[PDB]
Amino acid sequence: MKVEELIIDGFKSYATRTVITDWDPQFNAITGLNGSGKSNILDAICFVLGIASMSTVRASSLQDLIYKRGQAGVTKASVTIVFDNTDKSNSPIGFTNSPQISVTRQVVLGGTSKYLINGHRAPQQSVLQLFQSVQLNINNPNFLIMQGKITKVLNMKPSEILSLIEEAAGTKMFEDRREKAERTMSKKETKLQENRTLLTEEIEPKLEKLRNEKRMFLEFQSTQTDLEKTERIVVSYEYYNIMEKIIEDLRDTYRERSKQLNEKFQELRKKVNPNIMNMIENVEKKEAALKTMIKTIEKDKMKIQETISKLNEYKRETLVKTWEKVTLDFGNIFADLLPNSFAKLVPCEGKDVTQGLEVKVKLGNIWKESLIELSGGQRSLIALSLIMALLQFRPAPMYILDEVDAALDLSHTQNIGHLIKTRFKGSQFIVVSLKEGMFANANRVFRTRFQDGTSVVXXXXXXXX
Amino acid sequence: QSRLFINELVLENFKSYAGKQVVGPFHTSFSAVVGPNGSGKSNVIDSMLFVFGFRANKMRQDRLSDLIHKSEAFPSLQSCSVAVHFQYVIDESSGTSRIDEEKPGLIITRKAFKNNSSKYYINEKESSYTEVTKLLKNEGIDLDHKRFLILQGEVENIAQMKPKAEKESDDGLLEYLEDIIGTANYKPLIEERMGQIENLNEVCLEKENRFEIVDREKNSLESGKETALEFLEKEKQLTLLRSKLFQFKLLQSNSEIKDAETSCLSEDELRELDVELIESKINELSYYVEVLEEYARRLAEFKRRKLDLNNAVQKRDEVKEQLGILKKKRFDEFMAGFNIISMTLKEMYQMITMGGNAELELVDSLDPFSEGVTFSVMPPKKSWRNITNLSGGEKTLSSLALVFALHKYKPTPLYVMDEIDAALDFRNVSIVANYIKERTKNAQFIVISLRNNMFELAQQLVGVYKRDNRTKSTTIKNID
């Protein structure tokens, strides 16, 4: 994406249509004394993006962003943004048909905001997903239109700001908080797990007694069958040895006594339970539930230690990786921007990378420890260098820098422009200078000035026996 | 019958009577000792109180060594001793004097030793206190109460005496009249008994009620136990009938033995004993079939416990009736003596004062032992007032009337006083003087006062005089 066209009309300052073209695809410098006229562009852009978290952008009503609060003839504000979408990779899914994204933001009296994406309405969730597809969040160093006021906070800073800058690419505190919340949730669910185990332990004796009763009934049935077989064998023997009508219809005192005892036991141990199939089905279902519960318990028990080990390993690996990469990058940038110098990241006093690291700088040939020994211009320069080295973690096809050059020097601005033209190739950079008289090596210097209120550039017995 | 009386006193090395001091003989009818203010009469009353063992509450205990002569000229002497003599005298109708024993009756001495030692000697022979006080009580002189002593202390106590014994030590007017009538140590004992025995009766009645509840539960269980026993008896009868039927059936195919032998007249009774009804009864018994030791079980133990509880309740009622009878026999003679002494004090106040009326009355009207007895006085030309809101004169008048009523109730041959009628009108002094002179003849009295009308009627004048810090007594008659 290359910003080569800008159309701003119907705003607090851009009341007339000003010809704004001839943009350089390598370096863009919009300078001049018209600070409000230049800031109105970023105001309109952030109003299109819906950002309302700035002391100069946040208003009580949406009518304030219109020309003279929409009470001086211009009762509506309509802007049109044309973003080049030749890069199909960075483009969102399902929107690669349009070669150029056209966003028409129109607001009228009343406070209603319009949404247009290539000629179609879109809710806030759709545009939020479209922004996330191009790496545009709310709590991230992205949304290049404005990064905040980190440059002023960068002055008189402890190692905490540097550690958070490193964690912006590291992102370890969020993981720690999420894992603490998950551990608390698991410790709370342990009570429900214990309740489930107690319920299963209370259910078990019922099925145990059911199995015992089923076994007793089976034993009684087997004894009754044995007694019946013995009685049938005795009747067959008596019939073969031999009033025969009763003997035909029916078909050793110890055997008779045993048969009577077995019959009495079967009569006294009936235990009628025709649902033995349902009982064994409930038993196997309980067994499956118990084995799945124990398998889940052991799974989470292993997962806890596995996640702990992975946390430690990833933490150490990312720590050494950043301590190498960002240190080398900062050293190279400090050597390229400031000639004959070298700044590095060193622990405070015999500390580790986990505790914190401070920046050791070199003014000429004199190693300086803290930033208090440096002038305000050098502090602003190192802040600009740090905010330029930080944006490489979240790359974007374009970038817009807004009023961070407080007291830069001439040769330092020349070196910055040379590094941007040489090292920062492939990125469309726009910069709005706060103080003039700098950046004399820019290929295109947009001299924006305030003018007309706008900006211009028997057989049985035998068988038995 | 004769009465005992004192003749003379002897002192040896007293605190105020140095050397041997022998008092003259006293009169048989009436005597009187007289001395100036602060002349040593306090020493005399202290010696009289020490003779009878009634130690005063002013000096500390075991300090009798002060009775020995302790002065500047004699800082240390040998020992102290006092001696009193007693003898018999007869009082006839006309004016005379008869004696049954010309020899002295008894001699009581009590010596003091500076190492805080004392001893009693009767008839110059050593003795203890119990034997001599029993001998004195047998002679009509009971040392249990200080009837012979009349002191302003009792006057000021009665003037502040509450109707009940509100103080832990000071006895009230009710207790005072209790000691008067002699039934003092009869009320607290029976009261403590009626308390403790009644509490025991209450707790044993609670135990008996618990036992009765247990017996009621046992009877509720027996209500079903008896039905179970009746069912068991019916089952036993049915089994006996079934055995008899089986024996008859076994005999026809040929209690228990008797029915078996009578089965197989025999054949007639076997074939005509309602065979169909017998089978029906057997079937009914078999259908009903498909306890005996309850009489010899805890049910009998529960009945025995209930009987024991009833006996305990009866014994509690009996001891309650006994306590009620014991407490009922008191108020009869209580009110009897109350009315008697009331009449005596009424007539005494009517004859002496000739105006007003003093009277003790119950604050209530029914229960004499409810709250207490108050004492009101109506002076002449006045109204009824309490004993606490009067002057000293009315107080001592009521006190002398009360002690005269007590003397008339219980006789006493000895009576001593010391400045009881001091600072009064001469009229009442003359009245009590002629009263003790004429109306009293069967006893001996000792009066100490400064009024003129006192010694004018005293038959025996015993004057004490203190010269050079040494006191001596001289006794003379009333000759003129």
């Binding site: 978290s53 009580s60 009503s61 949406l62 406070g111 209603t112 905001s113 809710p123 806030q124 969730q125 709310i138 709590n139 505190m173 969020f174 908080r177 919340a181 | 105006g355 007003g356 119950l362 604050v363 209530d364 009207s365 029914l366 229960d367 409810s370 002449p380 030309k381 006045k382 109204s383 009824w384 009108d425 009229r427």
Partner: protein
């Protein structure tokens, strides 16, 4: 997730102050500056969203979880910030039902203008009247001190927001719900709620008066008091913003009828509350002719109640309606019965002899109303005067009849006489007497004021008997220490007395010296000075016309000591001593003159001898007066002997001239030969000689008893019984003889004998039977005196109970034994245990059982025996 959230019912600042999962994590972490900024940003973003109007579920879940956390925070417990945030989020405006439910119920459980703002900004719900009604019903049935606050809520719904729909809905749901009397502290809270509603805004509760009729017939007293106060406040507001409504006038009429019907309720609290309401609504700006007429006619008959506070409230009602009586058209502040009577007579005479017709008929009906009001106030004064004869009612009711007497009425002198007879606490009576009797108009001068006060005291002091005047002078001496009567009034009364020798046509000539001797009883220096004023009048030529003036002047001169015995005073007195017989008078004059001569003199003995020598020189009235003066002389001689004796004893006496100095000469050999108007003085002296050394008693007791038991004259019998009662102090036992004359044919003799009997028992003293028999006798004053004596001695009862149970066998009294027993059983004996068993031990008649059930004369023993 509304149902799930209803059933279940740092790093966060980097995203809240600068996604569904992130919002859920923040809500879980949040469950005071951070919370303050969070609620502020939430409130303003919600306001912006509502201003600018698929996005609703997120904000719904956010507001639900924020309400839940606010609820748990307020239940777990800086407060001003959260209350301001609640006011901000509530003015922004299904789930709203549960929203308002969980916003009001925890707030009601927790429970100062901030809370009022919270409760005001939460009633914006539309169609949710059932929920708020249920919540307020639970508040009234559970909370007590919050109900009144709910009333204030109705206030902010009545006039501040001007939405009559919700107000009338709440009113109808409150008036239609069923109420129970078994609720504890519930009816009281509801009564307080309605009272506050009527006190702050009674206009909206008036439109539904046709529905509150069910609440007007409540059985309890709290709701009745509340509703009578409510209608009182309603009629007050209706008469104050007259607004002249006819339907509201009909409502006023019907509620006034309800109050008239409820004025006779069987409860003192509701009666006093209705009295307070009618007193607060009678002083409004209206005429109410028939209303005030019926109010007065129903209050004049209900003043004779039986309770205490209702009586004083009724007297306050009468005073309030009297101080603002509408009868002020013609000659206001004047209620003369004669004036209204003569006006009515003139009108009715001119009627029998058309605007003039209307004017005369309205004047006639006005005079009729005036005469009815005057007869009503007269009869109410009569009832209150005969019932007043509790100290609060005595001290509060004085102002009413004082103001009544302030207006000239025909019952002025009679009313003053009744007031004086009633008054015998003290500070109130003396101050109203100083304000009324000692009044001083500013129009007149000092001399005119003194003359007016003199005329007042003359006309109020010359119309009474001896006893009431004695009590009045006692009360005056008890209030004379402030020196109210100045020197000018004393001078003017002395001048009036000096000019009285000669507007006094015999009705004030005596009254002047009466009030003179009446005021001289307060100070001694008043009678010591100005002796010549009484010398030439009381003892001068005026002393020969009327003897009452002589007696009163002798009283005045005798009160000097609380001239060096050389003036003509004693000479003039001795000159008046001369016989003035042949007249019914001269008895008390000499009776007091002899005392005035003896108690203060140089030597009364020589004067007494001179008198008894010059008097005996002399048809039977002469000897009668001689015996009288001799007896009184010997009595005063004994008195002076006693007084000199106690004076010599109090000097700071041989005791032979007082007790023994009674057997002197001047015996009575001539006084007793006349016995064995004529014999009256004979009996008097024969009974008075009983104090002479007490020997006359033992000499002639049977003779005097015989001549007194057969005395036909009742006055002589009363003299005998009073002398016998007095002789009990000076001592012989003459019992069983004075109790025989307790029942005589004359009532005065009985009164005198019972008075002496009740007097001797107090100081100077069985046979207590007749004192209980005379309880049910005629001459109700006797029964009242007997009851007062029976109640005065209760300062034992078993003795008199036994005496009565023993004397009940007299067989003389009938149908009065139970009455006497109930009369003597008023004062118990504090035990109730001994007499019970004493009666169970011996009981014969059925009256014993019936009066044991009644009060006194165990239960198991009584049931067994009977």
């Amino acid at each position: 997730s509304l149902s799930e959230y209803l059933t279940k019912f740092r790093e966060l600042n980097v995203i809240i102050d600068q996604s569904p999962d992130s919002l859920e994590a923040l809500i879980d972490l949040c469950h005071s500056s951070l919370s303050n900024l969070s609620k502020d940003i939430k409130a303003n973003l919600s306001s912006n969203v509502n201003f600018t109007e698929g996005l609703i579920p997120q904000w719904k879940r956010h507001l639900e979880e924020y309400g839940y956390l606010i609820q748990v925070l307020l239940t777990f417990l800086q407060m001003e910030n959260l209350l301001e945030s609640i006011t901000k989020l509530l003015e922004i405006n299904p789930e709203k039902d549960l929203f308002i439910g969980l916003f009001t119920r925890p707030l009601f459980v927790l429970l100062k203008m901030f809370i009022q703002r919270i409760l005001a900004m939460c009633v914006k719900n539309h169609g949710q009247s059932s929920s708020i009604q249920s919540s307020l019903m639970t508040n009234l049935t559970y909370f007590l001190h919050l109900s009144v606050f709910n009333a204030e809520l109705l206030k902010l719904l009545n006039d501040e927001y001007n939405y009559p729909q919700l107000t009338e809905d709440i009113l109808k749901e409150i008036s239609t719900r069923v109420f129970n009397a078994k609720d504890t502290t519930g009816p009281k809270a509801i009564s307080n709620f309605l009272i506050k509603l009527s006190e702050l805004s009674p206009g909206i509760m008036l439109r539904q008066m046709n529905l509150v009729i069910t609440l007007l017939n409540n059985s309890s007293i709290t709701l009745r008091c509340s509703v009578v106060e409510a209608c009182g406040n309603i009629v007050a507001e209706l008469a104050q913003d007259p607004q002249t409504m006819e339907h509201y006038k009909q409502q006023i009429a019907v509620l006034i009828e309800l109050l008239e019907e409820r004025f006779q309720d069987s409860n003192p609290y509701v009666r006093t509350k209705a009295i307070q309401g009618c007193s607060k609504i009678c002083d409004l700006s209206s005429k109410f002719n028939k209303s005030k007429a019926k109010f007065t006619s129903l209050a004049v008959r209900s003043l004779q109640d039986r309770s205490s506070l209702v009586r004083r409230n009724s007297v306050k009602l009468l005073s309030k309606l009297l101080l603002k009586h509408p009868f002020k058209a013609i000659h206001g502040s004047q209620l003369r019965l004669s004036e209204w009577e003569e006006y009515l007579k003139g009108s009715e005479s001119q009627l029998n002899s058309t605007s003039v017709l209307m004017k005369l008929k309205l004047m006639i009906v006005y005079y009729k109303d005036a005469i009815s009001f005057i007869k009503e106030i007269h009869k109410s004064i009569e009832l209150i005067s005969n019932l007043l004869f509790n100290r609060n009612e005595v001290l509060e009711s004085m102002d009413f009849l004082v103001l009544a007497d302030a207006f000239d009425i025909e019952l002025s002198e009679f009313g003053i006489k009744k007031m004086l007879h009633l008054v015998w606490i003290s500070v109130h009576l003396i101050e109203c007497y100083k304000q009324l009797f000692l009044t001083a108009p500013d129009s007149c001068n000092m001399q005119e004021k003194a003359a007016h006060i003199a005329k007042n005291l003359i006309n109020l002091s010359i119309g009474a008997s001896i006893a009431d005047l004695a009590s009045l002078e006692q009360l005056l001496g008890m209030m004379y220490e402030q020196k109210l009567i100045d020197q000018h009034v004393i001078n003017i009364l002395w001048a009036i007395y000096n000019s009285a020798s000669k507007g006094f046509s015999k009705e004030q000539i005596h009254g002047s010296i009466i009030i003179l001797g009446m005021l001289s009883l307060a100070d001694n220096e008043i009678a010591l000075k100005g002796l010549e004023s009484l010398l030439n009048i009381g003892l001068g030529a005026v002393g020969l016309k009327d003897l009452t003036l002589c007696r009163y002047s002798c009283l005045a001169l005798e009160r000097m000591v609380p001239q060096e015995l050389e003036d003509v005073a004693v000479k003039k007195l001795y000159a008046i001593i001369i016989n003035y017989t042949k007249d019914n008078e001269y008895y008390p004059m000499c009776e007091q003159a002899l005392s005035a001569l003896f108690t203060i003199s140089s030597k009364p003995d020589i004067l007494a001898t001179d008198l008894i020598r010059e008097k005996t020189m002399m048809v039977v009235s002469l000897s009668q007066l001689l015996f009288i003066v001799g007896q009184v002389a010997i009595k005063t001689l004994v008195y002076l002997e006693k007084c000199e004796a106690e004076f010599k004893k109090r000097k700071i006496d041989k005791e032979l001239e007082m007790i023994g100095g009674t057997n002197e000469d001047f015996t009575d050999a001539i006084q007793f030969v006349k016995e064995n108007m004529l014999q009256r003085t004979a009996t008097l002296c024969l009974e008075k000689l009983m104090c002479l050394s007490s020997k006359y008693c033992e000499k002639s007791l049977p003779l005097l008893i015989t001549v007194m038991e057969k005395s036909p004259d009742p006055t002589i019998r009363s003299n005998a019984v009073l002398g016998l009662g007095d002789m009990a102090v000076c001592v012989d036992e003459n019992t069983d003889y004075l109790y025989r004359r307790l029942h005589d044919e004359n009532l005065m003799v009985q009164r005198t004998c019972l008075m002496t009997v009740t007097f001797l028992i107090l100081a100077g003293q069985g046979q207590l039977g007749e004192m209980a028999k005379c309880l049910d006798n005629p001459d109700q004053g006797i029964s009242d005196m007997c009851r007062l004596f029976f109640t005065e001695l209760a300062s034992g009862f078993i003795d008199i109970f036994s005496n009565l149970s023993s004397d009940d066998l007299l067989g003389k009294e009938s149908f009065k034994k139970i009455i006497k027993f109930l009369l003597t059983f008023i004062d118990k004996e504090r035990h109730q245990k001994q007499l019970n068993e004493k009666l169970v031990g011996r009981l014969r008649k059925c009256e014993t059982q019936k009066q044991w059930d009644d009060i006194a004369f165990x239960x198991x023993x009584x049931x067994x025996x009977x």
